[PDB]
């Protein structure tokens, strides 16, 4: 399949070279896989989700996304126009308030929810969890991410936006899960992207158009925007049978474009997510 005049990051993940604007992907499109988005919520009514997104859990007085951050990230995973895996199911876990803040105890509660809840859903091909959030180091946050991964979920995590070593952030610093850095349209590391040996993979993160609240769309930048590209790519690859939850981060790194990026510090991998599609 080919989606013409695609947002740049979708084009980037199906290309060996920068400078193209056509997303190429297998029509299976992540069907039968599921992705949880642990964030500020998802506007499930948005036209672009086509009835494939729902809110399953909140920890606040409402399950609606009043911020927008969660809906944008959900759109890069699974919206018809802006998403990687256009036919995936999208579950929303509201762990952050409408200001984008959340206590670590609530975040952990949402992670353990995913590990259990997945057993109550129909996701025969695969289960991913996108975690576009982070904060100060904590072994307990890292352990919850480890537990989720250990249950049979692929957990993608944003490295953080401090131009800093990601070892000091959580759950970015948990080795067993997939830690995602941000790149720009000219194959540079984004100038805000955390780096370091704990990073697994880079994905598009600067100027990423996706869905917002009110049925709208906008562009924003962050490692939070790279992470849903990788979460959607894993779902897509599990639907194709190429990899499993426990092996998808490694599969992605092995199949990635290698040595494309610039602004990579010594000690950080030079690996850009690639879907390997050959029409």
């Amino acid at each position: 399949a080919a989606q013409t005049n695609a947002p740049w990051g979708l084009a980037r993940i199906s290309s060996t070279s920068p400078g193209t604007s056509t997303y190429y992907y297998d029509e299976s499109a992540g069907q039968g896989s599921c992705v949880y988005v642990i964030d500020t919520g998802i506007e499930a009514s948005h036209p672009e989700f086509e009835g494939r997104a729902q809110m399953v859990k909140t920890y606040y007085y409402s399950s609606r996304d009043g911020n927008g951050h969660g809906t944008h990230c959900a759109g890069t995973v699974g919206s018809r126009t802006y998403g990687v895996a256009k036919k995936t199911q999208l579950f929303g876990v509201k762990v952050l308030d409408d200001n984008g803040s959340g206590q670590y105890s609530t975040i952990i509660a949402g992670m353990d929810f995913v590990a259990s809840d997945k057993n109550n859903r129909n996701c025969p091909k695969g289960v991913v969890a996108s975690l576009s959030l982070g904060g100060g180091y904590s072994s307990s946050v890292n352990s919850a991410a480890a537990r989720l991964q250990s249950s049979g979920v692929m957990v993608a995590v944003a490295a953080g936006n401090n131009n800093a070593d990601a070892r000091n952030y959580s759950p970015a610093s948990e080795p067993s899960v997939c830690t995602v850095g941000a790149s720009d349209r000219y194959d540079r590391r984004s100038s805000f992207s955390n780096y370091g040996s704990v990073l697994d993979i880079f994905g598009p993160g600067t100027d990423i158009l996706s869905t917002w609240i009110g049925g709208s769309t906008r562009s924003i930048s962050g490692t939070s925007m790279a992470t849903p590209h990788v979460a959607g790519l894993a779902a897509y690859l599990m639907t194709l049978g190429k990899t499993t939850a426990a092996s998808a981060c490694r599969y992605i790194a092995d199949t990635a474009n290698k040595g494309d990026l610039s602004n990579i510090p010594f000690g950080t991998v030079n690996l850009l997510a690639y879907n390997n599609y050959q029409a």
Binding site: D39, T40, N67, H69, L96, G100, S101, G102, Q103, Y104, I107, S132, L133, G134, G135, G136, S138, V141, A158, G160, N161, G222, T223, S224
Partner: peptide
């Protein structure tokens, strides 16, 4: 402690 969107 408090986490935030990235």
């Amino acid at each position: 402690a408090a986490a935030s969107v990235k």
